[model samples]
Target: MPLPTTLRPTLRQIRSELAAQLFDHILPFWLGQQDPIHGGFYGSITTGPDPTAPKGLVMTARHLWTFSQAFLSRPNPAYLEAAGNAYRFLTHALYDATHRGFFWSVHPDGTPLSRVKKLYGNAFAVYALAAYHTASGDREALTLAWETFDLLEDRGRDRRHGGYYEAFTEDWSTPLPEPLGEGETPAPKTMNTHLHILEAYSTLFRTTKEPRVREAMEHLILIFRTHIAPSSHLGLYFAEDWAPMGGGISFGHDIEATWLLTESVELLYGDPLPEWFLSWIRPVMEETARALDTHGGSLPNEQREDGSVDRARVWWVQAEAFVGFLNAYSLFEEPRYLDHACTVWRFIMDHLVDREGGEWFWAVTPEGSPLAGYEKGGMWKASYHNSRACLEGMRRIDTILEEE
Candidate 1:
């Protein structure tokens, strides 16, 4: 079930498209967010590309990770300069000198507004630090990454329960709100934080190969297998005792986890996860692709537990699908998988791309209208997912063409 010969893109064509998007579109769009006077990038921006929103740790760290990766991939000085500004702001402004981890949000003037530390925030901090280290070979970045890992192990990991805790106070002594933020079920542990921890740990281990990091990575995969969801679907929110909390199926998380989990396995073991495991996951991917596919060529937001579906197609979901479906096509040689990947990309081009502005809209209605009032660049939205999709798609396309 290879891609239909006529429908397949040439490696040269894909290479060109990816380069154009990365350099001309994505990188430039994010580079515009950098705030020269205040330090880091502006915290948020409207779909108008307005910069009234305050800066936050999550977006800044993700922006740092995105630019660091871009610099590593292409060695552009502009990208490096942006990464350097993010690094400086993250360490000097966002970071708490007294507390161990980063503050959650900050004012435009580099003053901390919310000093609470979320493990989810720390996970991305580790990821950003590791990416910076990889790009610049700065030992300090690696050292901070290790320190972040130590914090996760020390305070976040559940000694009684097995998974990690959600958030903590500035001093890292008391945990924060339950379920850990919006749309989260009322539970002590969650799939959201754990998924990111796995992502961060995988990056950390790949960069440093510290034995403890490797162990944490292995434990996270095991936790996903045992608690999140055994074989096919990933349980969205989980209780402290590893009990499944939410009954809804998130097609976005399912497909995103399919590749993230697989990559973690390969990164650690030098091979794919066992065939029996992938055997179950392949159908999950196929079924999710079918269930979430919209008339507009993008996946729906999520299916709630009470049989309600969020039909708004989000930016990150489509971006993840673009890569996840392509990964599925590569794994199973399913022509439909490749077809779905192309479909999502088409929808993104038509609907998500903010042609008048830069970067992408937050989400679009099923009818292809942009969801109004959502910031184009904000605490929750950045260039990372969409830009990473382009990079990942290019890499997978290169592999396919090379095989041909």
Candidate 2:
């Protein structure tokens, strides 16, 4: 059943509890990652660092976006300071001024590690740059965000078939064709990259009101409609011609995209969502619900074609599930959606939160045991999803209450 969230006291307590997790736990955990002597946080937000592990595009860029966004919501000096520090390292270290794109990774000493670029990686840089610009009112950040936006459109996009391609040489010389998913043979494009590019362009459009950004956003929506998410679920990988590359169902991504795509459109286009969009969202959520562990409120990572489930309850998926279901509840006022949101948050508290350590374990078994050997933070993992989840959930609940 849907939660009785319309009750004023219950809603207020939910928001307050979310604030505690964000301020008391999530934000503090990442704050400890800040490099005091150096400008930004660690290359990878880790408990213990390998002396030589390469710093990555996703980690560095996500830090800037997360902190900048953290400041925008609550207006704390510490968050802004953390954002400023990340902006410095992002522009100086990971950014390729000469080639006009961010590097895939940098060495511990801040020299370029992998000069090959991925749209998925650089899209996060655009995502971060736009937020930092908004938070700090720094024109340079805006300029860089626009530059990256243009670079992505110019080089990363497939003008022939539509949608963006994933990887290339740093200088845009030729296809790099890096491996994706479980193989060395690369996908020509991916649902992951375009989904993020939609996110990036959505934020960039909000800040700049760029006509090009708006157009790109529309293109992305169309691509998803006709090519990417032709069914209730999104295709994981695609060919140059936008054919599905064969896949399993990623419940995490399917649910995340459900709310996130709505958010991107609503952020630029304004609310009271059109019925067409709402219809699409409802089934997407229901489809994802197939993988939900109703008893435990746990969402496993993915389900394979062979009818076997991956059964790895990941940290980031829970974070997305919390906000995504809440967004569904807000839209449909469906009790079950709110119920799922609240339960998933509980599951995160019970299983994912590493009280013995810091941050979160990457994945836990279906039986709720932490799989050993995963780092707290990694190239693909950072504070962005969790921090955003807390704040977004709080904001959504507040909106829900206000409507009542």
Candidate 3:
């Protein structure tokens, strides 16, 4: 059932809508299967969901995490059952057990299609598997999370400089170029990857307050403080050595990071965040808030080198914008901030949503047009962003509605 906004939805109604959207539409549309030989949902939102398309390792990881978390959050038996199926596909088909981490990509029939193991790719696995453990009480999920956490910290961390490296060679010893998408920059440390690490670590910490996890979480906070320029108020992406290679602040990342960064610090340090941490994040969040001041509440895609705004309504950007605004409002109690959240949500519901075919179009062009070749799934566009956005907003709004 869709959310009945016409009649103000109660908490139960909102939850029901989310369940139908998640367990009914979003999950099955993207991650379910009936063809036994084919095994699991093989198609990605990428290239706009062709049945003949191959399954992606990244998608598999996201599916596992999202479904697993749904179980823990709602304790629905259907969600738990779905999570188990996702777990089976991930462990049996997605894992490269001999090679040490999951594959970069796989075939529809779960064959080893791409052998390279990307570090960022593996981070999603850690995130999802950890969530599975919480939902299913599966010890193996925690073990897998720990294994990937260790690998990511030991192998992916850039100790000499700062932040985690994005890609690694097949043996996990060398750096490789970032896999690119439309208008994506080739940077060593991306706001996108770093944000995910923040997200992954935040969730992992919630389940287990391991000292190492705490240490890594603190290190990430420091990384943000140093690399993310408070003056420019933009996240800096760079080459292997943290040299500026010129990627601007991403709205999607900025909004996503504002809350996730806050969550990270809170997890690492508890309620009374140090003055220095508050000083660092407040300005960053403020600048992010300013970036949304435009014709409408919507955020532009990203600012280009020439200072031109992309003006595209990417699904994730809008979703993050809504949460980002709400997060800001929670801190400052600003009416403008709450208004921004409402308008962005309106924009998302009106412009970004695909009421026709389902899910969302990957992104709209600069002039509010959809891109030709940007597929919804594959490497990106998995459940991590938009689906998670709906879940987050529903819960947050439910809390807000109760106050009224």
Candidate 4:
């Protein structure tokens, strides 16, 4: 059910609380972790505390995007400074001058360690650079962002298959074989890469109304509607011809795509959504939201095609589900959607947040115990998902209150 009108903590109160967490807890912790000597933020940190951790390009680029977004939310000098540091490290250290796209990882001293061009990493670069342009008025950032877009289309995209390849060599001439799972051969395409490309292009389109960007964004939406599925357990791994190969259900991605696809439509079109388009997306959103349902709590990590569930609760999955369910509520005004959104927020507060530590834990088991061997901050974990969830949640709440 929808939150009671006379609820103790009003929507405005919740917004204020989230704003405080973003400003005080999340942003301050990340700021403290910045590597002034090395340039960008430290690569990894142990859950409790650690000063030295290897940095990765993917993590740095995500930091750039997050802080730039923070700066955009409010004109804070600290946020701007953080964004600048990340931008400098990204453009100088991580960027492959020998090749075209960004590298996989780099030494803490700002030297390229791995030169392979993962499209997933490149999409984050595009995402960060475009926001950096908006935050700092850096024309070079925008230029490079567009250049990265061109590179992805020219090399990563499969012109005949209608989707993008997973990764490429340093020069982007040949597709690299990267394994998706154990005992499985590397597939040519993946939903994860294309999902981010869709997300990155949505941000790029928002910044620059270039026709080419619009075309790419539209094409991604078509692929989602036609190829990607919610019911028949949509396969993430794909072959060169866009055929589903390794099929399974990523509940996190399914729910995350629900709101992202809606945002893309709004960004591409405008207010008062096209009737035909709404009809097309509504069912997908609801069904996927239902598919990921945790009976009023947050979603699980994934469900394999063999029907086994990996009931581990991941940080990013919960973060994205919070906003996804809220987006569904905003679209349909379903009280159940609002109920699930609130439920997920409570789950994060009780389980995900590291009270002894500063940031969030990587994952928690079904019994609510924190999972072992995962770093609080690492090559794959960062502030992007959780911080963005808070930021986006506040914005979405504002829209909901305005309507009320």
Candidate 5:
């Protein structure tokens, strides 16, 4: 099917919604008085439209990345200024001068809250800093990114195993105990961090082709094949030692990983991988596309074996679905992939985006009730995932537009 015939209207509607959310929601959400006392953005906003929680590293760092990238999408001086606030907070409050990586959380007033560190935090630092560097042309931002890369490789890496480990206290001393965090499978290693590593490393490698970066990039590609079990066709969340822990499936992660994995392979190995990735990725992509129907248009969080579904439509998940489906269509030239992409955009337009708030609501129940516990702007819920999706989709659309 060439996309339900109504697909074009849906795409236009969704694109408009994303654009509106970027401005009407995300722009003001950050541009509003940060923690005028603490600097950076405020910590949390209760369901009542006012920020209430203390500031933290993840929220500030993601704000830096979000607004910086947002400025790229639509040049607004206010957004850039908000990016500056976030940058200053990350530097003064979160960045550990004695240690290499960032602090886990910070007080509402910009004091050191949790000085203990996590490699995952380091990865986000790298991601946000790199984008911040690109946005502002700040060399120090890039330097911070490389510093995190060094710290990541030095202690947090799994030399005996293939991928990287999770949290570490500041100074890289003791392994922190854990339930781990959301979107994570408790393991020595995880596909979530590894995928973002590929994402960050791709950006770094784009800027500089240092040998170790090349080595890291290629090594991760190999691990994807060896570590991610063939049967599940999804990257293992946790493992005894990279041996895959539990066996639940996340279709959002599956579809998202499909492109991230393929992009990494295409960037690194090119035609040498013998096309096996597509064999694995194609099935996962198809399954994800079908599962998307469960949410009406957006993809679900994960599918439980008991046949129950987590009907939450996460902001990041919808964002990734756009890119994943578009990539699928580009690769296969299949009409169904195109239709699926449009379907995802439709969901994004109708449900996932927040029309009145400053940014997207973190998650929405299947019935469309807002789960206000998820902040409109917070540590984990930043603008990168959705912002990048819009930019990526527009870029691809431009290519199609040019051809047409």
Candidate 6:
């Protein structure tokens, strides 16, 4: 599973750093967020913990996924406790028993805040439940995950065209409009939703091996191949008819999808993926690599057809790059891929990690200065990406190093 012995020293060093980051910094930061007075973890953390902020499904589900995954990689009662806390909050509070879908957010006192049933958060709800079941062998987690999967397939589907809609009302009778800014028309489909659906189904199939789960994964793979990755870059927005809308290239998503899609393909087939699939995505990942900054980290985005670029060194982009390049190295065993991964790791260590604060900054300018005024943890920012990157890198390094 590894490269030559000469690669071991670098891989071993990086593995040690990743472990330290996860165990000492990232894990402790989230662990401290467990609210003793409240039922679940705090919803927001900025200069200090923001206790009154409305609890959201995104943070709760991500916390579930983060700690569940943490326990899977490194077993500890504390990690499982964190995961359980998240699971209880998600199922009892954020999930609507009457409506039969996860909510967008809840009040600090566990009341519903945003009640819309959104694809993005529901996908993670399924994702988190699958991981929690794997870590703790909770039957309810598995069942909830399966039922949520069924609900999405039943309601979220665009029957006339294809792919899933972004969101809908609590009762599933109407489609919720996309939460874009003014003058932006809501696209019928979004790349982020499908990407995570692929992610959720990968774990769902792994957990249950159900026939429908496999078929879902296969269909999503085709969706990506025929529609999402058809252009030179990953098309970010699409119509119900599978035509592209004008969303820009997210370098983070591009790399993240590369690994997630590859993982799904291999899960269905086997290691050393089917040539047809590998040929399709290998070039896509290569194209994605062009977005990496020469100095370090990955660029955030480029306009769809305008050709302008954002040079911010976003934390999640760097996190995905670390794992994505390592995935490439594991697959092809190319020296450049390893080097690219290691270089990105160095970039992360230098700019992303917030030594002064607890977690990473939202992003830094091209000059490597932290962008001011962004909260450390919020609706979109959580422990999932960085913690997953650390665990993923360590696992890939261990496999390659032939270590348990």
Summed backbone clashes in each candidate are 2, 3, 5, 2, 5, 0
Better of 1 and 3 by lDDT: 1
Q: Candidate 3: where are CA atoms >4 Å away? A: 1-25, 31-35, 45-48, 179-186, 365-373, 401-404
Kindly list the per-residue Cα lDDT of model 2 for residues 1-404, writing each as its tens digit: 43564555756776887888788888888887766554556665445755456678899889899999899888999999989988998899888989988998887767888998889888999999999998999999988888888889899888999988788887887865536657545778889888999988888888888788888898898898888787788888877888777677778888889887887778656878888888877888886665575525689888786658888999888889888888887788777777778778878888888877877778898777999877877687888988888889888888877774
TM-score of each: 0.94, 0.94, 0.86, 0.94, 0.88, 0.95
- lDDT per residue for candidate 5 within 1-404, as digits (tens), equals 33344545555655666566667765665577477766877676644434446666666777788888888777788878888888988988888888768898877766677887777677777878988888888899898889899988887777887677767877787665345557755565667767777777776776676778878888877777677645435754666477656556676777777777777677776644436777766777878777877557777787664557787888788778888998887666676776777777776667776666646667877666677656666666655677778777876755544442
Give the alpha carbon lDDT tens digit for every residue of 15-47 in model 6.
999999999999998899887876788888888
Most lDDT-accurate candidate: 6
Clashing pairs in 6: none
Pairs in clash, predicted candidate 1 = 43-54, 43-55
Error of 1 at 386 (Å): 0.8
Question: Where is model 1 more than 4 Å wrong at Cα?
Answer: 1-3, 10-15, 47-52, 179-185, 293-296
The deviation in Å at residue 148 for candidate 3 is 1.0
Better of 2 and 3 by lDDT: 2
Give the C-alpha miss distance for residue 307 in model 4, angstroms. Answer: 1.0
Off by over 4 Å in 5: 1-17, 48-52, 177-186, 229-236, 269-274, 305-307
Residues 347-404, model 1: lDDT tens digits: 8878888778777888999767988878888889877898788889888888777774
lDDT value, candidate 4, whole model: 0.82
Each model's Cα RMSD: 2.2, 2.2, 4.5, 2.2, 3.3, 1.9
Q: Rate the local accuracy (lDDT) of all candidates.
A: 0.82, 0.82, 0.71, 0.82, 0.72, 0.84
